[PDB]
Structure formats: C-alpha cells, structure tokens
C-alpha cells in the first residue's frame, strides 16, 4: 500500500497532461470506448409552409481499444526486504515518474502523429485536416543577429498556428503551447510568468517553468518530448526521423484529447521459486485519444 | 559497517501485447558491497583558561 | 456493440511432458474486431380497417 501511494503521488506532481485530455474510462468490460463525433449539428429555420427533410446520421465515431498494458519488473531476492522502509518509498517515486513521462510522452506521439489528418468525407463542414506550418530555426548561431533572426521565426510560427486554429472557432481561455527545452530557451524575453494558473485548476503538485505568456496563451516548456523510433505503449507510436523535429504543439485543453483508463495503477507482489526471488511489479491499461484532430496545431523545425 | 546496493535501482517499462508475448531478458545487476573505513573528527584543543560553556 | 474474438482458437493442447524439460512455442492469435452498425429490419404496414391481431 505504502509503495502503490507513493507512484500514485508522483503522478499529480509531474504528470502534466492529468489535467490537460478528458479523463475518460472504460466502463464496459470489452476494453473498448467510442469517441462520438459530432459532425450534424447544423441550424435551420421552419418557415412556417415550409415542409421539412430528414435529416441523416452523419457521426463517423471512432473506436479506441486498450491493447496494451504498462507494467514494471522489479525482481527482488529474498534476503532483500522488500517491505524496509526508505527503498519501498524511492521504489515508488522513481516508478511514478517513469510512468508519468511515458504517459507524457505517448500523448506528445499522438499529437504529433496527428498532424497529417486526412479529415474525410461525412466530416468536412466540421472538421478539417491537421496543420503544418513550417519553420526554419538555425540553433547553432551565437550572433545576436542570428539569435533574434530565430525568435522572429518562431513567433511568427506561433501567430499563424494562433491565427488559423482561431479561425476554425476555438476559443482562446482555452488554449495551451507545449515547447522543447531548447525551442523554450530560444524564446525571446516575454517575462510574463504563469506561477500557477498555466491552464490548470486547482493544481499544485505539478511544478514547471512556463514563465512566458506568447500572443495572449501560456506556453509551458516540455522536457519530454519524442526522439528516438520507438514507444512502450503500442507499436503505432513508433516516431519518425520527420515527426522527431516537431518541437512545438498548440493545442485545445477540453476539445483535443481523450484519455481511457482501462485499468488503474494496481501493485502486485508475488513469488517466483524458479529464479529465487520476490519479483514486484505494478502495472496499469490506459490509451490516448486525439479526439478532433483539427483542434491541435504543430511545426516542424528544420535547422539550416 | 558494511552495506549491500544494487547499481541498477530500477528497469524500464516494456508494455506487453493483446496477444504477442515478450521475453524478458533481465542483465544481472552488479550488487555493489561499499564499507567504511575511516573515522571523520573535528579536534580542538580548548585551553584551561578559555570557557567550555561559551555561546 | 462491439466483440473481440481471437483469430485461431487451435491449440494443440496434446503436450508430451515425458522430457524434464519443457519446450514451449511462441504462438501468437490477431485479436478480432467487429462491431454492428446497421439495423436490419422489414416494414409492413396494416391499414386502420384491415386487422392486424387476427391469427
């Protein structure tokens, strides 16, 4: 119980997306949840004499299946306690965080998989396709020349992924921009400083360095951001070469992602007599939908 | 005065499949054993006259 | 209104356990996915004179 707190509690300290995608679950026992699409929603006027048509289904919804589970394996001996304080409690906190950034991450996959969205057809009058906006950031450059040259770019990256996702009616009280390290320090000065109110409400575990208020939204600086070609969770969220340079994210915090809970975080201890150890292991079910793909804008850098 | 640690305090998340297992292939972690062997002190000598209890 | 069933529910249980040790093979099942959309029906309409009841 001790151990099954402390990698819960790691979650609400920096887990960033708790509190930024629906959190959804569930509730059947198929471990399959359906995304409803809304795509008829269209206003029209009876005129009195006017006779009136039928009006079709027009909700192409998706289907989202957790396949996938996330466990961790920590073989342990028997001369090893296990249940002695001070390794349980840093068991817990180092579990915790590595489940709370592949969570991160996973959700950083998606949004950046979704960037090519075909939109097709019985959704058109209400969805779009994905945005891909350009840029071209040279990070090796220490002139002061250079370095303003590359703020310039990405604010004005920044404005027309503003300008077109405002476009498609989003309103921007919710709005949040997700930064790479080094895209964040490349950022002009813009000191306004979101100490506890960066999209999150009543949040006080999750402490990060979003300092900086670009074009009227807070844009909070994400340390985990996808490189490399591979994920845990599934085998779609394989990242390429492309999708790697991704480096900066606008987005919607209630209409962008939807997040399932198969299963919660459940720690389970158990003997193994055939290697000689008390292998420990707490395993949780969770997805990551990107429900209305329109809503989420990305640019892909490209270093000269 | 002799204590016992692992090097590697914790693995990775692997993530199993609907329907395809995996095989684990745990490397043995180098248990590391780490004594002390030295005694750490402060020496004053204080003289006769000086006072001990001085704030 | 959705099931999953797996693709090949074969399985050669028949496993002779005369050698001390096991020999398992990694065998793998695709997990199928069907879900039911349309709503199959037929339409009869009976006038308000007619009777329907009757047998």
């Known amino acids: 119980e001790v151990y099954q707190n402390e990698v819960d509690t790691r979650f609400q300290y920096q887990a960033m997306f708790l509190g930024l995608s629906s959190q959804r679950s569930v509730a059947d026992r198929s471990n399959t949840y359906r995304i409803d699409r809304l795509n008829t929603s269209s206003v029209k006027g009876r005129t009195s004499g006017v006779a009136l048509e039928p009006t079709p289904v027009r909700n192409d919804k998706m289907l989202i299946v957790v396949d996938t589970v996330l466990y961790i394996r920590n073989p342990i001996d028997y001369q090893d306690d296990w249940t002695a304080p001070d390794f349980l409690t840093e068991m817990g906190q180092n579990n915790g965080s590595e489940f709370a950034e592949v969570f991160d991450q996973a959700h950083l996959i998606q949004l950046i998989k979704g960037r090519s969205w075909v939109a097709p057809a019985h959704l058109k009058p209400a969805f779009s396709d994905g945005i891909e906006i350009e840029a071209t950031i040279d990070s090796d450059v220490t002139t002061q020349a250079g370095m303003e040259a590359n703020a310039i770019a990405i604010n004005q990256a920044h404005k027309a992924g503003i300008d077109e996702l405002i476009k498609r009616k989003v309103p921007l009280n919710?709005?949040?921009?997700?930064?790479?390290?080094?895209?964040?320090?490349?950022?002009?000065?813009?000191?306004?400083?979101?100490?506890?109110?960066?999209?999150?409400?009543?949040?006080?575990?999750?402490?990060?360095?979003?300092?900086?208020?670009?074009?009227?939204?807070?844009?909070?600086?994400?340390?985990?951001?996808?490189?490399?070609?591979?994920?845990?969770?599934?085998?779609?969220?394989?990242?390429?070469?492309?999708?790697?340079?991704?480096?900066?994210?606008?987005?919607?915090?209630?209409?962008?992602?939807?997040?399932?809970?198969?299963?919660?975080?459940?720690?389970?201890?158990?003997?193994?007599?055939?290697?000689?150890?008390?292998?420990?292991?707490?395993?949780?079910?969770?997805?990551?939908?990107?429900?209305?793909?329109?809503?989420?804008?990305?640019?892909?850098?490209?270093?000269?």
């Open 174 to 304: 919710d709005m949040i921009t997700l930064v790479s390290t080094e895209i964040y320090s490349l950022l002009l000065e813009h000191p306004k400083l979101f100490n506890k109110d960066w999209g999150d409400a009543n949040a006080n575990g999750y402490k990060e360095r979003r300092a900086v208020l670009m074009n009227g939204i807070p844009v909070v600086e994400c340390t985990e951001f996808p490189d490399a070609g591979t994920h845990p969770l599934g085998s779609a969220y394989t990242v390429t070469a492309d999708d790697a340079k991704c480096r900066m994210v606008t987005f919607s915090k209630s209409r962008t992602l939807v997040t399932v809970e198969a299963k919660p975080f459940t720690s389970r201890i158990w003997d193994d007599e055939q290697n000689f150890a008390n292998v420990l292991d707490c395993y949780a079910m969770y997805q990551v939908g990107e429900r209305r793909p329109d809503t989420a804008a990305v640019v892909k850098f490209n270093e000269a």
